[PDB]
Amino acid sequence: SEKLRGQISGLKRASLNAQDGISLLQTAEGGLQNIQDMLQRMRELAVQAG
Amino acid sequence: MEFSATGESEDIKLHLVDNAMEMQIGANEGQTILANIPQVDTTSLGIDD
Numbered sequence: 001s002e003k004l005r006g007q008i009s010g011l012k013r014a015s016l017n018a019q020d021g022i023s024l025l026q027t028a029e030g031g032l033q034n035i036q037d038m039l040q041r042m043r044e045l046a047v048q049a050g
Numbered sequence: 051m052e053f054s055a056t057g058e059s060e061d062i063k064l065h066l067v068d069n070a071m072e073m074q075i076g077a078n079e080g081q082t083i084l085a086n087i088p089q090v091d092t093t094s095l096g097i098d099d
């Protein structure tokens with residue numbers, strides 16, 4: 001009983017930790033998407049000249 | 051009247067720089083069109099005198 005209760009509590013804690021982690025990657029992806037969108041306008045205006 | 055050659059050489063120096071028209075016609079490097087327009091006037095046509 002003691003071993004199983006310990007494992008159950010650990011599983012619950014890890015379950016919370018995973019979502020705590022995933023939020024960070026979501027934010028980073030959003031920022032990188034903004035940067036990617038900007039670079040294309042830079043390319044278009046660069047090819048404007050010539 | 052009498053004419054004669056000077057007998058000694060003369061040096062004249064000429065400076066000259068290229069400056070056609072380049073048009074970008076493609077969406078990448080190298081894709082271009084070159085355009086020239088020669089000079090036109092009385093001196094070029096040879097009727098100035």
